[PDB]
Enzyme design. Structure first.
Site, PDB file in Angstrom:
ATOM      1  N   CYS A  10     -71.433  76.886  25.717  1.00  0.00           N
ATOM      2  CA  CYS A  10     -69.975  76.848  25.709  1.00  0.00           C
ATOM      3  C   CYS A  10     -69.453  76.895  27.143  1.00  0.00           C
ATOM      4  O   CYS A  10     -70.213  76.779  28.110  1.00  0.00           O
ATOM      5  CB  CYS A  10     -69.424  77.987  24.838  1.00  0.00           C
ATOM      6  SG  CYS A  10     -67.772  77.703  24.144  1.00  0.00           S
ATOM      7  N   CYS A  82     -68.398  73.920  22.512  1.00  0.00           N
ATOM      8  CA  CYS A  82     -67.183  73.413  23.123  1.00  0.00           C
ATOM      9  C   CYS A  82     -67.131  71.904  22.908  1.00  0.00           C
ATOM     10  O   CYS A  82     -68.149  71.253  22.661  1.00  0.00           O
ATOM     11  CB  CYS A  82     -67.120  73.732  24.619  1.00  0.00           C
ATOM     12  SG  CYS A  82     -68.626  73.467  25.605  1.00  0.00           S
ATOM     13  N   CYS A  89     -67.393  72.257  29.949  1.00  0.00           N
ATOM     14  CA  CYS A  89     -68.304  72.185  28.810  1.00  0.00           C
ATOM     15  C   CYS A  89     -69.581  71.535  29.330  1.00  0.00           C
ATOM     16  O   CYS A  89     -69.580  70.333  29.632  1.00  0.00           O
ATOM     17  CB  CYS A  89     -67.697  71.390  27.658  1.00  0.00           C
ATOM     18  SG  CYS A  89     -68.652  71.497  26.119  1.00  0.00           S
TER      19      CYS A  89
END
Length: 138
Positions: A10, A82, A89
Site C-alpha cells: 500500500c 492501493c 502506490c
C-alpha cells in the site's frame, strides 16, 4: 506444510493493507505468512484499529512500516491494495503472482469521526469479503 507468503502492499501502510493483514491472519490461519508494507510509511490510523477491534480482531502487533527493508525478500503473492493511480502506490520486485485489489482509501474520506468510521467499516467489510473468497478458492 509451510505457509504461503503474502505481502499486502500500500501507500502508507496505515489502513487498507493493515486491514488486509489482520483479516488474512484471521481467515487464513497458519496457512499464510502475512506481511504488510507501504512505500512511505505513516502511522496506523486510529480508525483502522477501531474497526478491527469492533470485530474482535487484535491490533497490538500492527505497525506502519516501509517496503524498502523488504526489497530483497520474495513473496509468493504480492497483493496491492492501493490503486495504481495513487501517488506512492508502489510495485514490488520479487513475487510469483502480483494481484491488484484496489480499494477506496478510507483515510481520504472526510466528515465527522462517525462518518469516517462508516467508511472504514465499509472498506473493512469489502476487504474481508475478498479475503474470504480468496482463501476459499485455495
Amino acid at each position: 506444510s509451510r505457509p504461503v507468503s503474502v505481502l499486502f502492499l500500500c501507500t502508507g501502510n496505515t489502513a487498507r493493507s493493515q486491514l488486509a493483514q489482520v483479516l488474512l491472519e484471521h481467515h487464513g490461519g497458519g496457512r499464510y505468512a502475512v506481511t504488510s508494507a507501504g512505500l512511505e510509511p505513516g502511522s496506523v490510523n486510529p480508525l483502522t484499529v477501531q474497526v478491527l477491534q469492533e470485530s474482535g480482531l487484535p491490533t497490538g502487533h500492527l505497525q506502519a512500516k516501509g517496503v524498502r527493508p523488504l526489497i530483497a525478500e520474495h513473496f509468493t503473492y504480492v497483493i496491492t491494495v492501493c490503486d495504481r493511480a495513487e501517488a506512492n502506490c508502489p510495485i514490488f520486485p520479487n513475487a510469483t503472482y502480483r494481484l491488484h485489489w484496489p480499494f477506496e482509501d478510507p483515510a481520504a474520506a472526510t466528515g465527522s469521526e462517525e462518518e469516517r468510521l462508516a467508511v472504514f467499516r465499509h472498506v473493512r467489510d469489502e476487504i474481508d469479503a475478498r479475503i474470504q473468497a480468496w482463501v476459499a478458492a485455495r
